[PDB]
């Protein structure tokens, strides 16, 4: 189910058993659904006959290769089944080894006899600000079951096993996103897309020539300057880590669901890595860094390759957000991206239409596990996951 009208009818065999609010329920409290556990199941959950658990050491290059192969062949597609995310090994290390990462939380499923990797789910630690509470949580990502094992109820077992492994470490809340509606979204966001190379996007069927509009007309509409306009824009450097951390922390206070990053976490998530993460800061005529923009790299295989930038965190205190995002588009164009993607969260609705983004067909639902709180509009969500 991808809409709240489809989810209105369904029943949820697994999620009814979990500490999440009911889909109908309207919530006006803030806090855990169930108490922290003082005794945790020591044995892994039972898998179907012929499968076994395995913690994936991603510092092993052959194991990392097994994971991105599983993901590139079996992870998230567009609902038209035209494009699948193409996760690089280096991107996965970025997403899966932030500060505090644990090997037991890179949780694989393998065929017993052949050791073939056929399932995965991960947790990474994060301090999360939710309304008036700060909690240590984990972020769950990359739940993946091999296409030939789909619909055999392996997903709930992966969820219960990563839950157990996170409980063993004393953590009892999680945050996660999904394109499907489950009990119960804390917020719902929409993806928007900004064409950068319209000839390629229409050719590969990512977009279509709009009503009574030529190709030549479409390139003109999406044409961008060759260089950014904001004075003082430059790549983030090591010396910028503290001020980027300061800028981000103060800026995120206006939203209701945000990460709380240490300075080491800021370094990991924002320090530029070619073909993974780009961060540019604005250093003004006084030498003060006053703003920054960032986007990560996630190409898609055309089931060539579709080179997509995803808006990450953008902080403005002296440059208008509108101007900052214009330069983000210019930079992504310069770096050879075909499309620039952004959600309607934080303040993004103030620039999406102005900058000629077009709305997409998917929903991104945000969820908290074992935390019951009021839902929020997209503009109060201040958390971006990979």
């Amino acid at each position: 189910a991808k809409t709240m009208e489809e989810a209105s009818k369904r029943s949820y065999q697994f999620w009814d058993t979990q500490p999440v609010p009911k889909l109908g329920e309207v919530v006006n409290t803030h806090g855990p659904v169930e108490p922290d556990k003082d005794n945790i199941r020591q044995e892994p959950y039972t898998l179907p006959q012929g499968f076994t658990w395995d913690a994936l050491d991603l510092g092993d290059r052959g194991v990392l290769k097994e994971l991105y192969t599983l993901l590139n062949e079996n992870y998230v597609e567009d609902d038209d089944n035209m494009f699948r995310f193409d996760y690089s090994p280096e991107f996965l290390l970025w997403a899966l080894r932030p500060p505090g990462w644990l090997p037991q939380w890179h949780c694989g499923v393998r065929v017993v006899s052949s050791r073939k990797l056929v399932g995965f789910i991960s947790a990474i630690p994060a301090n999360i600000h939710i309304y008036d509470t700060e909690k240590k949580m984990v972020e769950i990502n990359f739940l993946c079951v091999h296409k030939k094992l789909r619909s055999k109820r392996v997903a709930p077992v992966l969820i219960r096993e990563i839950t157990r492994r996170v409980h063993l470490e004393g953590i009892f809340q999680a945050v996660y996103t999904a394109g499907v509606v489950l009990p119960k979204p804390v917020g719902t966001c929409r993806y928007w897309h900004r064409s950068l190379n319209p000839r390629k996007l229409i050719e590969v069927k990512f977009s279509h020539l709009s009503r009574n509009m030529t190709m030549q007309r479409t390139m003109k509409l999406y044409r961008l300057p060759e260089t950014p306009k904001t004075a003082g824009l430059r790549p983030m450097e090591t010396k910028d880590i503290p001020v980027v951390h300061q800028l981000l922390t103060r800026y995120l206070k206006q939203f209701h669901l945000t990460p709380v990053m240490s300075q080491e976490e800021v370094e990991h998530w924002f320090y530029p890595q070619e073909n993974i993460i780009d961060t540019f800061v604005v250093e003004n005529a006084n030498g003060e860094v006053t703003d920054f923009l960032s986007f990560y790299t996630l190409p898609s295989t055309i089931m060539k390759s579709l080179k997509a930038a995803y808006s990450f965190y953008n902080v403005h205190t002296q440059t208008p957000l509108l101007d900052l995002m214009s330069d983000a588009l210019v930079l992504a164009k310069m770096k050879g991206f075909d499309v620039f993607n952004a959600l309607d969260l934080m303040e993004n609705k103030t620039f999406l239409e102005k900058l000629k983004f077009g709305i997409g067909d998917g929903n991104l639902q945000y969820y908290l596990y074992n935390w019951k709180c009021p839902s929020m509009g997209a503009e109060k969500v201040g958390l971006v996951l990979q």
Partner: peptide
């Protein structure tokens, strides 16, 4: 995660 395209 969600993969979207222009509507």
């Amino acid at each position: 995660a969600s993969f979207s395209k222009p509507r």
